[PDB]
Amino acid sequence: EGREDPQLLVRVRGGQLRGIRLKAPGGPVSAFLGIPFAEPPVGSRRFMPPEPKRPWSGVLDATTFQNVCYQYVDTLYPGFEGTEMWNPNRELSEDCLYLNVWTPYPRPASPTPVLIWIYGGGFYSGAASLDVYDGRFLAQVEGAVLVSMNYRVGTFGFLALPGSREAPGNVGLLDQRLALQWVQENIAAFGGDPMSVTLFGESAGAASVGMHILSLPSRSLFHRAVLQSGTPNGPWATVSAGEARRRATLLARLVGCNDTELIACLRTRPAQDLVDHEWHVLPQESIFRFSFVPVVDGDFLSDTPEALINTGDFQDLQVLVGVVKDEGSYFLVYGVPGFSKDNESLISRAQFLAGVRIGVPQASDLAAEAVVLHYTDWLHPEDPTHLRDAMSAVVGDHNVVCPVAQLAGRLAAQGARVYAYIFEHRASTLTWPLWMGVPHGYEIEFIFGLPLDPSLNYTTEERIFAQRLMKYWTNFARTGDPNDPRDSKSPQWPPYTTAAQQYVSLNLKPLEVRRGLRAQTCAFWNRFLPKLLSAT
C-alpha cells in the first residue's frame, strides 16, 4: 500500500483485503466482493461440509464478484429478460464459496446493524452477484452493512446418502452457516455489529433462513429474520432421508454408478454430467418441486420442519414474513400445458384438472378432487379466465401462501414477534405478461432499492415506494419493528397475532391493515388436506 484509498484496505481473520469504491445514486459506498470463506469444495471435497478458508498471504483483491456455484442454466425463453435476470452472471464453478460485503463510505465509526442476504433459486440455482441483489443502495441510503454469500446448490449442495460420512446432506446449508460464522468473527472490521445480525432471503432463501431458525447451532449467529415468499415447512423445501437416498442413488445410476463406492464414483464425474441428469430423478411430473433440497437428517434438522415449528420455543424471536400477490403464476409456464408468457393462457377445465395433478404432484385422486372442488367457481365452472387464475392460486397457495400462514401462526403462538405483509405492486418495468400479476421474486428489486438508480426507468412513485420498503426492512433489522418511531401514525404496522391475524398491504398507497391470510383456503391446505392424505 501507499497510494491506495485508505478506506478500501481491511484485514480479516484469513488475511488482507482490498475493496472497491462504488458509485450509488446518492454517493459512494465501499464494496468487498468475492471474499473466500471456505476451502474450495472441489475434488474429494465434493458433497462434503465446507472447511473454513485457510489464511492467505498478501492483499487479496476483493473488487469483483467471484464464480457462481455450478448449476442448471434456464433456457425456457432464450434472450428474455424476465428469465435471464435470474441466470448466472459469472463463470460457473465448483470453486464458488465466496461472499460479498457492502458498507457506507467512509465506513461507520460506530457499529452498524448487519443484513445478510440468502438468495433463492429452488436450491438448484442462484448467485449473490445478480443485479437485483446489489447491496449498494441499502448500504448508501440506510447506512447498512450488507452481506451476501454463495452457497452450493443442486447436487453439489444437497445430494445426500443420509447416514454416510462422505455425502451427509444439507452441505449447502452448511455453506450458509459458515458465512454466518465468518460474519460473527469479521464483520466488525467493516463497522458491522455482530450483535445485530438480521437474516433475509426469498423463496429457497426464505426457506434457508427458516432452517437456521430451526437449527440450534445457527441460532447464535443471528438475531432477527425476514422470510420473503418461502418457508422451511411446506411441500418443496425438504425431503425425507429415504427420499433423498432414493434420488441420490437414481442420479448415480443415471451417470454410471456401499455408500463410499457410490460417492467416490460420483466424485469422478464432471460437474456438467451431474447437472444434465438432475431433473431426471423427481417422483412425478411436477412444478414447484426440486430434485436436491435440504434433507431431514436428524442433525442439521432434528425433525421435520412441521414438527419443529409446532413444538418450538420462539420467545426471543422477531420475524418479518410475507408473500407477493401472485405466488403461483411463475412456474405455470414451466410445465403446466396451456400456459405461456406469449399469450393470455386461458385454459379449459380439462387443462385445469391436469394442471392440478402437476401442481399438487403428491395428491391422491381424492385429494386432487378436493382441490379442484375447492378452487372451481361453481357459477362459472368452465370459464377460462377463472380457471387460469385458479390454477395459479392452487400452485401459490399450496407452495407459499399457506406454508407462510402456517409458519406465521405457529411462531406467533409460540412466543415470537411476527410482522406479515403481502406485496401487491407490479413493477412498471416487468416483462412477464399482465396475467402473471406480481410473480414471486419481483418484490426483491424494490427491497434492495434498485428504483433509486435513475437509469432504470422506474416511475417516481416507484422510487418513493422503494424507499418506504428499505426503511421498513432496515427499521426491522435495527429494532425488530418495521415502524418508524419518529414518523408516528402513517399508519402503523401491527404484529400478526393468532387472535387478529393482521398483516399489511405493500403497494403505492399507504399501509392498509388486513385480517386473515387466506384463512378459509389455508384451513383447507393446512388442516384438512393432511388428514385426507393420512387416510388414502
Ligand SMILES: *[C@@H]1O[C@H](CO)[C@@H](O)[C@H](O)[C@H]1NC(C)=O
Ligand atoms: C431506460 O430508458 C430508456 C428510454 O426508454 C430505454 O432506451 C432503456 O432501454 C431503458 N432501460 C431499461 C432498463 O429498460
